[PDB]
């Protein structure tokens, strides 16, 4: 009763393969998933291909030129596990800490494989 | 009876100007509080007593 | 070195040597936890401390030295209206 | 203070599908390709006819052809088709072009529009901002040679918002967009958004979810249920605001006259001192633990932190990308270009800091706009007029943006590219009108 539903909503819904908003003179081509990552890489080859071509013309607008900068101030260091002003930070596993409770409550018996995953967050996961 | 007037606030710019006739001739520093901010154009004497208490960039 | 312990101002950059620590190889024992602890400590100053100090011609070492030489009426009567 | 539980549960919609047979064949479409909501409707209607959420599934069914009940809310009919849900737009921009066709197809059917030829109509299309090429050639395969669209126009969406709340379309502003994958601050002079100046942030809301689904299971590494990302966009869209100044309030954040009102705690589904102990509070805030109390292993004692999960937008640091926060750009754009400097500003700097714009799927979060309004303060000189301008739905505006350039037929011809000019030209061809992209190189 509720699977014959969704069939119902279905049949009022579908569109058979020659569908009707259609140029009616095109069919599928080859199409397969390209990373978004891969996207940015041949793009990325494009722009040094042009640009190489080029020298031997600055890009107005790319995707590369519009990704903004990094920061000229210093970044404010915060606690890893509590968010709180990181003051200290442990010398064995490079997590920065809030106080003695959260020390020797979590950063000491923190189990191996996880600091990684806590610097995760941060950005600085620095096991590859 | 006299007026004090005074500016508050930290050094985001410091501008020594030279404009010799080896001598400052003025020095342009822009101060900044939560408020907003502010340019002051000041003398070489200034200068000379902000050299003194080793003032540099981001110091209120 | 290494094993030393020392209490560092960060406001104004002074480190004074508390001692060598329980190193075999002055011994003083390893602090507690919790750095960067607050700490407030009370002072009481006299007030001819601080007749001598607001005095422009007299430095603290008069306070020790002992060469105040007839403090006037103004710094003082200013010291107690402060 | 008795204790309150919250449930994290979201409905089904019982009414997925509507429709209305009469359409005009000269009127164009307005769609609006968004990453959270896809938003459709005609020119002549003010408010956008269909918002769905961009996501399809392919539903499987035996003896019953294993094809149903493609897109729309029909997804959110049922939970385990909801589960399987395939949005196919990717982090830059869709992976999947099909499932994209499929997706219009569904519209063409929702807009009840007859079928002549491809399409009889030209087409109002969105785009984010710097498209790789390889995208663009796409765009113009699927749209021309695909569905014989007559004319089709894309541009940013935030640019267009601008354009919505300022129509003379000469004015000078600044706009900031929030959203929902990337964010990014777009300067923009005489009506024209030069998109060299503009920077881009790689934030967004998608990592925001992210972010605070990361920080939630860290927090509790041994909670017994398992929370649904669709319920972590429900608790991030229920208990979340910006602080007003982040560097005071984390100190006093976890400080116990301040735990009464800000912890709020949430329940899962399901069927030596306390003070003294900061991890306490952390973990399990106001009220003493129940260690045996099968409430409190279900309870997501949330909101001791909330503060950090929309605080990353202005420091990016924190989310692990090196890139300035959304301040130090409004820093380099308003004193540093358009011939300001620090301690003079140029008349166009001062006419965009007189109009600014916020939009975006990501600024319903309260709070935003007193932040944004005294972190501008906090920089910019004295008696310096700072006028910023909310939406009641910032998301929805770029829909408005659309019907505001089909009104505006004088400018609506400059953007409008045509069939003949992409067969002429190739794909390898944009044209430069003020309200969207610009080419590569000069």
């Given at each position: 009763?509720?699977?014959?539903?969704?069939?119902?909503?279905?049949?009022?819904n579908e569109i058979g393969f020659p569908s009707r908003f259609k140029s009616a003179h095109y069919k599928k081509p080859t199409r397969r998933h390209k990373?978004?990552?891969?996207?940015?890489?041949?793009?990325?080859?494009?722009?040094?291909?042009?640009?190489?071509?080029?020298?031997?013309?600055?890009?107005?607008?790319?995707?590369?030129?519009?990704?903004?900068?990094?920061?000229?101030?210093?970044?404010?260091?915060?606690?890893?596990?509590?968010?709180?002003?990181?003051?200290?930070?442990?010398?064995?596993?490079?997590?920065?800490?809030?106080?003695?409770?959260?020390?020797?409550?979590?950063?000491?018996?923190?189990?191996?494989?996880?600091?990684?995953?806590?610097?995760?967050?941060?950005?600085?996961?620095?096991?590859? | 009876?006299?007026?004090?007037?005074?500016?508050?606030?930290?050094?985001?710019?410091?501008?020594?100007?030279?404009?010799?006739?080896?001598?400052?001739?003025?020095?342009?520093?822009?101060?900044?509080?939560?408020?907003?901010?502010?340019?002051?154009?000041?003398?070489?004497?200034?200068?000379?007593?902000?050299?003194?208490?080793?003032?540099?960039?981001?110091?209120? | 070195?290494?094993?030393?312990?020392?209490?560092?101002?960060?406001?104004?950059?002074?480190?004074?040597?508390?001692?060598?620590?329980?190193?075999?190889?002055?011994?003083?024992?390893?602090?507690?936890?919790?750095?960067?602890?607050?700490?407030?400590?009370?002072?009481?100053?006299?007030?001819?401390?601080?007749?001598?100090?607001?005095?422009?011609?007299?430095?603290?070492?008069?306070?020790?030295?002992?060469?105040?030489?007839?403090?006037?009426?103004?710094?003082?009567?200013?010291?107690?209206?402060? | 203070?008795?204790?309150?539980?919250?449930?994290?549960?979201?409905?089904?919609?019982?009414?997925?599908?509507?429709?209305?047979?009469?359409?005009?064949?000269?009127?164009?479409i307005?769609i609006?390709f968004?990453?959270?909501?896809?938003?459709?409707?005609?020119?002549?209607?003010?408010?956008?006819?269909?918002?769905?959420?961009?996501?399809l599934?392919k539903?499987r069914?035996?003896?019953?052809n294993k094809n149903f009940?493609f897109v729309?809310?029909?997804?959110?009919?049922?939970?385990?088709?909801?589960?399987?849900?395939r949005?196919p737009?990717?982090?830059?921009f869709v992976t999947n072009w099909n499932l994209t066709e499929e997706i219009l197809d569904y519209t063409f059917h929702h807009?009840?529009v007859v079928p002549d030829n491809g399409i009889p109509n030209?087409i109002?299309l969105?785009?984010?901002?710097?498209?790789?090429?390889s995208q663009r050639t796409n765009w113009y395969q699927i749209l021309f040679e695909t569905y014989n669209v007559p004319g089709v126009?894309?541009?940013?969406?935030?640019?267009?918002?601008?354009?919505?709340?300022?129509?003379?379309?000469?004015?000078?502003?600044?706009?900031?967009?929030?959203?929902?994958?990337?964010?990014?601050?777009?300067?923009?002079?005489?009506?024209?958004?030069?998109?060299?100046?503009?920077?881009?942030?790689?934030?967004?809301?998608?990592?925001?979810?992210?972010?605070?689904?990361?920080?939630?299971?860290?927090?509790?590494?041994?909670?017994?249920?398992?929370?649904?990302?669709?319920?972590?966009?429900?608790?991030?869209?229920?208990?979340?605001?910006?602080?007003?100044?982040?560097?005071?309030?984390?100190?006093?954040?976890?400080?116990?006259?301040?735990?009464?009102?800000?912890?709020?705690?949430?329940?899962?589904?399901?069927?030596?001192?306390?003070?003294?102990?900061?991890?306490?509070?952390?973990?399990?805030?106001?009220?003493?633990?129940?260690?045996?109390?099968?409430?409190?292993?279900?309870?997501?004692?949330?909101?001791?932190?909330?503060?950090?999960?929309?605080?990353?937008?202005?420091?990016?640091?924190?989310?692990?990308?090196?890139?300035?926060?959304?301040?130090?750009?409004?820093?380099?754009?308003?004193?540093?270009?358009?011939?300001?400097?620090?301690?003079?500003?140029?008349?166009?700097?001062?006419?965009?800091?007189?109009?600014?714009?916020?939009?975006?799927?990501?600024?319903?979060?309260?709070?935003?706009?007193?932040?944004?309004?005294?972190?501008?303060?906090?920089?910019?000189?004295?008696?310096?007029?700072?006028?910023?301008?909310?939406?009641?739905?910032?998301?929805?505006?770029?829909?408005?943006?659309?019907?505001?350039?089909?009104?505006?037929?004088?400018?609506?011809?400059?953007?409008?590219?045509?069939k003949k000019?992409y067969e002429?030209?190739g794909p390898?061809?944009?044209?430069?009108?003020?309200?969207?992209?610009?080419?590569?190189?000069?």
């Amino acid at each position: 009763e509720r699977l014959l539903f969704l069939r119902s909503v279905g049949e009022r819904n579908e569109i058979g393969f020659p569908s009707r908003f259609k140029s009616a003179h095109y069919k599928k081509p080859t199409r397969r998933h390209k990373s978004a990552r891969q996207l940015i890489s041949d793009e990325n080859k494009r722009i040094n291909a042009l640009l190489t071509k080029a020298n031997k013309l600055v890009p107005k607008a790319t995707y590369f030129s519009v990704e903004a900068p990094p920061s000229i101030r210093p970044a404010k260091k915060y606690c890893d596990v509590t968010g709180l002003k990181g003051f200290y930070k442990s010398p064995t596993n490079n997590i920065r800490y809030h106080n003695a409770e959260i020390y020797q409550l979590i950063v000491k018996p923190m189990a191996p494989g996880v600091d990684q995953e806590y610097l995760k967050l941060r950005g600085a996961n620095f096991v590859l | 009876k006299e007026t004090k007037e005074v500016y508050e606030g930290e050094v985001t710019e410091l501008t020594p100007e030279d404009a010799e006739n080896k001598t400052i001739s003025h020095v342009i520093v822009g101060l900044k509080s939560a408020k907003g901010t502010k340019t002051l154009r000041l003398d070489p004497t200034i200068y000379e007593s902000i050299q003194r208490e080793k003032v540099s960039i981001g110091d209120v | 070195l290494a094993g030393d312990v020392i209490s560092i101002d960060k406001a104004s950059g002074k480190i004074t040597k508390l001692g060598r620590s329980f190193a075999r190889s002055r011994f003083v024992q390893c602090p507690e936890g919790e750095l960067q602890k607050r700490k407030t400590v009370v002072h009481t100053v006299s007030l001819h401390e601080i007749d001598v100090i607001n005095s422009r011609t007299q430095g603290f070492l008069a306070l020790f030295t002992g060469d105040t030489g007839e403090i006037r009426s103004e710094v003082r009567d200013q010291i107690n209206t402060k | 203070k008795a204790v309150v539980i919250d449930d994290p549960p979201l409905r089904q919609t019982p009414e997925p599908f509507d429709e209305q047979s009469a359409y005009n064949p000269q009127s164009p479409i307005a769609i609006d390709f968004g990453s959270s909501k896809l938003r459709a409707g005609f020119v002549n209607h003010a408010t956008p006819t269909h918002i769905f959420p961009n996501a399809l599934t392919k539903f499987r069914d035996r003896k019953l052809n294993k094809n149903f009940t493609f897109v729309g809310n029909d997804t959110l009919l049922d939970q385990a088709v909801r589960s399987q849900s395939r949005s196919p737009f990717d982090g830059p921009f869709v992976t999947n072009w099909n499932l994209t066709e499929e997706i219009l197809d569904y519209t063409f059917h929702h807009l009840g529009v007859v079928p002549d030829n491809g399409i009889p109509n030209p087409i109002l299309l969105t785009e984010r901002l710097a498209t790789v090429q390889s995208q663009r050639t796409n765009w113009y395969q699927i749209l021309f040679e695909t569905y014989n669209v007559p004319g089709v126009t894309f541009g940013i969406d935030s640019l267009f918002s601008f354009y919505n709340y300022n129509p003379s379309g000469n004015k000078t502003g600044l706009v900031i967009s929030c959203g929902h994958e990337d964010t990014n601050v777009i300067p923009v002079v005489d009506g024209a958004g030069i998109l060299t100046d503009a920077k881009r942030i790689n934030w967004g809301g998608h990592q925001a979810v992210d972010y605070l689904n990361d920080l939630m299971a860290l927090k509790y590494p041994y909670f017994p249920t398992k929370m649904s990302y669709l319920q972590y966009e429900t608790m991030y869209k229920d208990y979340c605001y910006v602080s007003r100044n982040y560097d005071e309030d984390i100190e006093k954040i976890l400080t116990l006259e301040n735990l009464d009102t800000n912890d709020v705690v949430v329940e899962a589904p399901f069927t030596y001192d306390w003070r003294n102990s900061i991890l306490h509070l952390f973990l399990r805030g106001p009220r003493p633990h129940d260690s045996e109390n099968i409430h409190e292993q279900h309870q997501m004692h949330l909101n001791v932190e909330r503060i950090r999960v929309p605080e990353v937008i202005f420091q990016p640091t924190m989310g692990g990308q090196d890139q300035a926060g959304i301040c130090e750009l409004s820093e380099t754009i308003l004193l540093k270009k358009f011939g300001s400097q620090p301690g003079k500003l140029s008349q166009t700097s001062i006419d965009m800091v007189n109009n600014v714009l916020i939009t975006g799927g990501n600024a319903k979060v309260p709070g935003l706009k007193e932040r944004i309004v005294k972190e501008f303060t906090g920089f910019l000189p004295t008696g310096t007029n700072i006028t910023v301008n909310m939406s009641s739905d910032p998301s929805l505006d770029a829909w408005k943006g659309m019907a505001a350039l089909a009104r505006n037929e004088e400018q609506y011809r400059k953007t409008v590219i045509s069939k003949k000019e992409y067969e002429e030209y190739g794909p390898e061809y944009i044209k430069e009108h003020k309200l969207g992209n610009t080419k590569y190189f000069e």
